[PDB]
Amino acid sequence: SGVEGAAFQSRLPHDRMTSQEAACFPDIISGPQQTQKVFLFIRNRTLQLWLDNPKIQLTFEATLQQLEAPYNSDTVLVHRVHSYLERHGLINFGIYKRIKPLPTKKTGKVIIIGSGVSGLAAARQLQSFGMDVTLLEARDRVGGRVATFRKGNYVADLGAMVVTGLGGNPMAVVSKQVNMELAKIKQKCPLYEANGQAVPKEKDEMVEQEFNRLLEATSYLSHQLDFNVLNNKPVSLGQALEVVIQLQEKHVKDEQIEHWKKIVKTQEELKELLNKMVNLKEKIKELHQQYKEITAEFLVKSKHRDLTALCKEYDELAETQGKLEEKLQELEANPPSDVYLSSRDRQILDWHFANLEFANATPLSTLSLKHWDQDDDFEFTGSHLTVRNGYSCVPVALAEGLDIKLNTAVRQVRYTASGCEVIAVNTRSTSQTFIYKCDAVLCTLPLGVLKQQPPAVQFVPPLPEWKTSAVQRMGFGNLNKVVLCFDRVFWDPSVNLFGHVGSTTASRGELFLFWNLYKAPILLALVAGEAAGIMENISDDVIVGRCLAILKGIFGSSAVPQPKETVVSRWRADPWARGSYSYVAAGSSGNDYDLMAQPITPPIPRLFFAGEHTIRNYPATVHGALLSGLREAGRIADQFLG
Numbered sequence: 001s002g003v004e005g006a007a008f009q010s011r012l013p014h015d016r017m018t019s020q021e022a023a024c025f026p027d028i029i030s031g032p033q034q035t036q037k038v039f040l041f042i043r044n045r046t047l048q049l050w051l052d053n054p055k056i057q058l059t060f061e062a063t064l065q066q067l068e069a070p071y072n073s074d075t076v077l078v079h080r081v082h083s084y085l086e087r088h089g090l091i092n093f094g095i096y097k098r099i100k101p102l103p104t105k106k107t108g109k110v111i112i113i114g115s116g117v118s119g120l121a122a123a124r125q126l127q128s129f130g131m132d133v134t135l136l137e138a139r140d141r142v143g144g145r146v147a148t149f150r151k152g153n154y155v156a157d158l159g160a161m162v163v164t165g166l167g168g169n170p171m172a173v174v175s176k177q178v179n180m181e182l183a184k185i186k187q188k189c190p191l192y193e194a195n196g197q198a199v200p201k202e203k204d205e206m207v208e209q210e211f212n213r214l215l216e217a218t219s220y221l222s223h224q225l226d227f228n229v230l231n232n233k234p235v236s237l238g239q240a241l242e243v244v245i246q247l248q249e250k251h252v253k254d255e256q257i258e259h260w261k262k263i264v265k266t267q268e269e270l271k272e273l274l275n276k277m278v279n280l281k282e283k284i285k286e287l288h289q290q291y292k293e294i295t296a297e298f299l300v301k302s303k304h305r306d307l308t309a310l311c312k313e314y315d316e317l318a319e320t321q322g323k324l325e326e327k328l329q330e331l332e333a334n335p336p337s338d339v340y341l342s343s344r345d346r347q348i349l350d351w352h353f354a355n356l357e358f359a360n361a362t363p364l365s366t367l368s369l370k371h372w373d374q375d376d377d378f379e380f381t382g383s384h385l386t387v388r389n390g391y392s393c394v395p396v397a398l399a400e401g402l403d404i405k406l407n408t409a410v411r412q413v414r415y416t417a418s419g420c421e422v423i424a425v426n427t428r429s430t431s432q433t434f435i436y437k438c439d440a441v442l443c444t445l446p447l448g449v450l451k452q453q454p455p456a457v458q459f460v461p462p463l464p465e466w467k468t469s470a471v472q473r474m475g476f477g478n479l480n481k482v483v484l485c486f487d488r489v490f491w492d493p494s495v496n497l498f499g500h501v502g503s504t505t506a507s508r509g510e511l512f513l514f515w516n517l518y519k520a521p522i523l524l525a526l527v528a529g530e531a532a533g534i535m536e537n538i539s540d541d542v543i544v545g546r547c548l549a550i551l552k553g554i555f556g557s558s559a560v561p562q563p564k565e566t567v568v569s570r571w572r573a574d575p576w577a578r579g580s581y582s583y584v585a586a587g588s589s590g591n592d593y594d595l596m597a598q599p600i601t602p603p604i605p606r607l608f609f610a611g612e613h614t615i616r617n618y619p620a621t622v623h624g625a626l627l628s629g630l631r632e633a634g635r636i637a638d639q640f641l642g
């Protein structure tokens, strides 16, 4: 299934046309289904040709010469499919050799706000389409939230560092184009408690099992019993989790109660049984006395078959007594669980919640119970990988040949029914400003900058209410890293990651996870959830000291030398980001991502949007950013080039 795999790798069903293709090829969708079969094959085959060699431009001509008969005869259809694929960034995207050099005459001018992956991806597309494009970047580097530290042989990412499974991932193509080295993340993640001792395989698995069960429960509660609103306030994932935990504790307490009652009941039956036996002994004594006084040949017989009958009674009770002392001791030896989670178990469980806070870049109490995993259905297949040589290799290579103006911060964006003006200032001399005129503006401003109050950049006219309302509802998280560069490796080189279990629920996200990913002796420590924003207020030295303390508790002091180099990110305080990435906040939904993607048009579309926050099925990702850029380049070219 070569062509079939090509469609998969392109996130398209191989045997049916998408709604997009239906709209662009209405004559095919509403026509002979045999022609649709032909359409799909041309489409799947063209994708295969491009995917099999993503370093070279796939021209219409080369596509035609590589298609087998009878397909190579339907010249017009092939061109229509090739044009569509190319326009929408499914082929000829990223970085590749052009066999058809760009035309000197550039049509239409577009200003791209932001030199991150979304802006870079859109820029390269728009340029290859023959448009005049210039990127305005506030920083003194490209890449935005993809940021790599490089010094000597030391390499470390302060922003994006993980690639999520290549099957269907556009980054698979970009990886090949820039020769980026990817290493699969080994699953083994040993956990160490606050005292530094490792958590036994048993408990680790047990608690991880409970974590999974608790999450599954919140999903059942949400997508079955429709428990998504309470007191008119949307329910958060954190909220639902604590409720599920409470029920588990209630259930444990109930089975404990019932058990104690079995004990008490058995204990009462015994006391009462012992009491009638004591009375039967007193009744036997009444006989082993008195009994012994000439008709006796019949009086002794009588007193005998009488005194014995009282033993066919007594030791008979000692029997029905042994069946209780047995039942009793059996119960007081097999007690149900005393608690749902021991104090130590709860801390380990909090580590798993912190991990989830890292993945969504926000405390669980802010996540939408109903929509936090709204995009799960779009995950790519395969192991998640890490960028051994620094993720910045992508934006750096994508910037090749582009007209990028660094140290240029945009402060105003004017858009009228007949053109656009973008005002920016030099960040090195806020005295001098710049005024760039253009036909269209592509804003790849991070959601955190768009939420900023007072606003960092002004829109004239101001953005619509349906747009600003979406920006306000959507969540924008935070996550930070501490890069520790050593001259020696004192950790287990075969382990990619290991966790640090915090002491309290509130600080569970503080330096809870360490990553071993590079050539040089470098460790990355994460700061998630509530800890992320707070720790930004701590100086590098103090935060590094707390890292070494964690490390020394694990590997022993004297084993951990002082770091030669350290880097600490503070994404929330970074004025060009104001956070790490978006998340679906309680009260928001995947629809806000669609609203974020909508162009603003006063008589015709003028202001466009790209960025990790404008792509519903792939939010908060580098690939999502990439795709949003390809998407917008297509929408813009359609408007200005037709």
Ligand SMILES: Cc1cc2c(cc1C)N1[C@H](O)C[C@H](c3ccccc3)[C@]13C(=O)NC(=O)N=C3N2C[C@H](O)[C@H](O)[C@H](O)COP(=O)(O)OP(=O)(O)OC[C@H]1O[C@@H](n2cnc3c(N)ncnc32)[C@H](O)[C@@H]1O
Binding pocket: 113, 114, 115, 116, 117, 118, 119, 136, 137, 138, 139, 143, 144, 145, 146, 158, 159, 160, 161, 162, 163, 164, 408, 409, 410, 411, 444, 445, 446, 449, 457, 479, 480, 481, 571, 575, 576, 577, 579, 580, 581, 610, 611, 612, 613, 619, 620, 621, 622, 623, 625
């Ligand atoms: C910061 C950060 C982010 C991540 C991550 C870590 C950190 C510390 N990692 C996390 O460790 C895990 C997270 C992840 C892993 C697996 C699945 C999903 C996500 C990840 C990662 O590994 N992998 C990933 O794909 N994305 C990450 N993310 C998110 C991705 O990095 C982003 O979604 C993606 O890089 C976003 O690119 P973009 O093009 O949408 O936006 P920016 O790159 O922010 O560019 C906007 C530009 O506007 C510029 N600017 C600001 N004001 C200006 C103005 N008005 N005019 C001129 N320029 C302006 C800013 O400098 C900025 O460069």
